[PDB]
Structure 1
Amino acid sequence: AQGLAGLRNLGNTCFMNSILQCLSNTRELRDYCLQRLYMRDLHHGSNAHTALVEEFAKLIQTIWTSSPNDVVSPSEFKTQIQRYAPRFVGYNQQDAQEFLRFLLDGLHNEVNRVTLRPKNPENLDHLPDDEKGRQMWRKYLEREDSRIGDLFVGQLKSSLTCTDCGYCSTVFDPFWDLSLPIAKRGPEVTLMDCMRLFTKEDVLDGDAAPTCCRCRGRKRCIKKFSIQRFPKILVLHLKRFSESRIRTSKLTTFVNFPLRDLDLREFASENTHAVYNLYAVSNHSGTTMGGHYTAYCRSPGTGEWHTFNDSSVTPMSSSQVRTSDAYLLFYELAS
């Protein structure tokens, strides 16, 4: 079938390939590239990074027009991303989430419908904080507004209650992914366990006591995340690093995550059905210092999973996609 082309290792570029395949199989992002819609959104005038979006799009196009075991060489795209993000110059092993962030940032900046970003953070205390969520959202949207954002951007609500005066200070943070701490409590730790750890009430006291501006002093406060706006594509990042003050080690903890019906209603601030199906996983195997990346991806529409391992593309069953090596999870809205 289609989109089952591999990517040449160019010298430790598995981190880059794994992400490229997760994005290749991101339906709406793929179609954006195949349908050549980025061309409209591109900025006029001589730019340094016009080539990033065009080279990315051309890679995706090549992948999706190739024969079933062709190997594509992303070398020209690499040259573009390393110009944008100098840290990717050369041939050292890197983190694939760091890569995903720099790349989406670069692609987003180049097709941003906002061509000159507007320069005020006023007080919205008279407003129900779902109304202020919306105001914050539209303020964000008048600086960052692209087709990439359409897909990946959600909104966090952070509610910080002073235990003295009871005031609940609310802030709304946009997010392009969520980075989840891993539960220690295992029968087994689940994705839901990690999401509840992220959204639990953090009791802030002692050296963590924030200042309450109503009380005009440092108080014990309770802080809680909830999801105010759910993104079309939900990227979940497992925080697989121990906290060591000397020497960090990778947590290889199996985190059980679902293929289908990831129901996140629990985490909504006051939702309207937010349920996801999995369609890609970037896998890491090794240590914090070194190892290898692969991707498991579900062909859009097709329900068929493949293991993408640099130049090698191989069918797999869904009973093989959940592993300890899962580091990033790509979810899409279900029907």
Structure 2
Amino acid sequence: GLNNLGNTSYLNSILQVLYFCPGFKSGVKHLFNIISRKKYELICSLQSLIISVEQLQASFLLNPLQHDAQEVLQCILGNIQETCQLLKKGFELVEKLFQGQLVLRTRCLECESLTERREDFQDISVPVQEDMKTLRWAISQFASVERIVGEDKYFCENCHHYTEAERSLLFDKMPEVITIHLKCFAASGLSKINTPLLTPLKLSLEEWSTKPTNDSYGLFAVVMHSGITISSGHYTASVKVTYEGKWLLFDDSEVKVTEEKDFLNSLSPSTSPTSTPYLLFYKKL
């Protein structure tokens, strides 16, 4: 009868990733208790879903339109955040789990003056190809010094002129969960890039941090998209259990337990996978 789960595979993948985020369902339970003795429908349906999935997972262990997944994640997280602010006027669940802060610097190449902008972020949108690559290459393309020249000259208020500039991004405040949004799509007209990056199990962003940090990250969830186009396809999710150390493979109605080695080998771009990674999730160690 679960031949209808596939219709919401974007939402299913996002819910399977959020159910295994550390501290997410604890925070949702806390907000649900608050809203209960307040007497919001998103929090209550989230609680109902988490209890249903707890029932199903307890049974498993003992008695064996089409939409974008990142956009659905964004909508759910924004709704939870708004609920938290309203209940505030414990209430910093999204801020502590998924929200970091960037320091964006611009250096004019004429006067060599530095201007800074501070912006929040919930995920990191990195490219997958240039116009075999690793995730380090993509985060460098995101955050290393880029020179903006030509038609994209910077207007410097100090020179009162158009100048070439160097932009660089740095990670200041860090969330507990790092979401890598992979831009696996290109424009000439629009097509999907099926070649994935060489994804690591361990990630360090100290190369692009404002301060020297020893905090490393570990890959625990991957959302993949299957299809030759960007307008249609199927979303799957691979989550790591922290069975602890195994990767659960969610495909519509059937779940597969997997070794970390087999999962990492399936992620390899040398095997040419049909499931293209789209969202990578890294939790602080």
Do both proteins adopt the same fold according to a TM-score greater than 0.5, normalized to the shorter chain?
yes
1:68 aligns with 2:51: no
Residue 30 of structure 2 is matched in structure 1 by 37
Q: Equivalent residue for 2:77?
A: 104
Counterpart in the other structure of 1:53: 43
In the TM superposition, 1:194-213 aligns within 5 A as 194-213=138-157
SS in structure 2 at match of 1:321: helix
Task: Answer yes or no: is the 8 Å Cα contact 1:154–1:174 preserved in 2.
Answer: yes
- Larger mean CA deviation between 172-181 and 324-333 belongs to 324-333
1:151 matched to which residue of 2? 97
Aligned sequence identity (%): 29
Amino acid at match of 1:293: Y
1:194-233 correspondence to structure 2 within 5 Å: 194-233=138-177
Write the distance in 2 (CA, Å) between the matches of 1:192 and 1:11: 33
* RMSD (CA atoms): 2.4
Give the paired residue count: 269
Q: Match of 1:207, as an amino acid?
A: E
5 Å-filtered alignment, 1:115-134, equals 115=88
Distance 2:121 2:3 in 1: 31
C-alpha change, 1:270 and 1:175, in structure 2 (3 Å) is same
Tell me the secondary structure at the aligned position of residue 37 of structure 1: helix
- Residue deviations 1:171-221, cap 9 Å, x none? 111000101112439xx2111111111112221223211211122222111
Answering whether residue 14 of structure 2 is matched by residue 12 of structure 1, we say no
Contact 1:155 1:173 survives alignment (8 Å): yes
**Alignment CA distance shift 1:8-1:159 (3 Å):** farther
Give TM-score, length-normalised by structure 1: 0.74
**1:297 paired to 2:243:** no
Cα deviation for residue 301 of structure 1 reads 8.8
User: Is the aligned partner of 1:328 residue 2:279?
Assistant: yes
The reply on whether 1:248 has 2:190 as its aligned counterpart is yes
1:147 Cα deviation from its structure 2 partner: 1.0
Aligned partners of 2:37, 2:79: CA distance in 1, in Å?
A: 16
State the partner residue of 1:283: 224
CA gap of 1:211–1:106, structure 2 versus 1, over 3 A, is same
- 2:248 aligns with 306
Cross-structure match for 1:126: none
Q: Is the 8 A contact 2:223 2:235 kept in 1?
A: yes
CA positional deviation for 1:108: 1.4
**Aligned equivalents of 1:177 and 1:310: distance in 2?**
25
Which position in structure 1 is the counterpart of 2:270?
A: none
SS of equivalent residue, structure 1 residue 214: coil
**1: CA distance, partners of 2:111 / 2:33:** 52
Residue 10 (structure 1) shift? 4.7
Find the counterpart in structure 1 of residue 17 from structure 2. 22
Considering fraction of residues, name the structure with more strand. 2
Is contact 2:224–2:277 with CA below 8 Å preserved after alignment? yes
Partner SS, residue 229 of structure 1: coil
**Distance across 2 between alignment mates of 1:301 and 1:113:** 39
Unaligned 5+ runs, structure 1:
1-6, 71-91, 117-144
Using the TM superposition, give the Cα deviation of residue 313 of structure 1 relative to its aligned residue in structure 2, in angstroms: 1.1
Distance (whole Å) between structure 1 residues aligned to residue 4 and residue 15 of structure 2: 12
Paired residue secondary structure (2:190): coil
CA-CA distance at 1:39 after TM superposition: 3.1
TM-score with structure 2 setting the length: 0.87
Does residue 84 of structure 2 align to residue 94 of structure 1? no
Inter-CA distance 114–45: structure 2 relative to 1 (3 Å threshold): closer
1:274 to 1:65, Cα distance in 2 relative to 1, 3 A: same
| Per-residue deviation, 1:256 | 1.2
Return the alpha-carbon distance in structure 1 between the equivalents of residues 245 and 116 of structure 2. 41
Greater helix proportion? 2
Contact 2:96 2:176 in 1 (8 A): yes
Structure 2 residue runs without a partner (length 5+)? 268-272
The code of the aligned residue for 1:296 comes to S
Pairwise CA distance, 1:12: 1.9
Q: Secondary structure at the match of 2:191?
A: coil
Shift in Å, 1:40: 5.4
- Secondary structure at the aligned position of 2:140 is classed as helix
Which AA in structure 2 matches 1:321? F
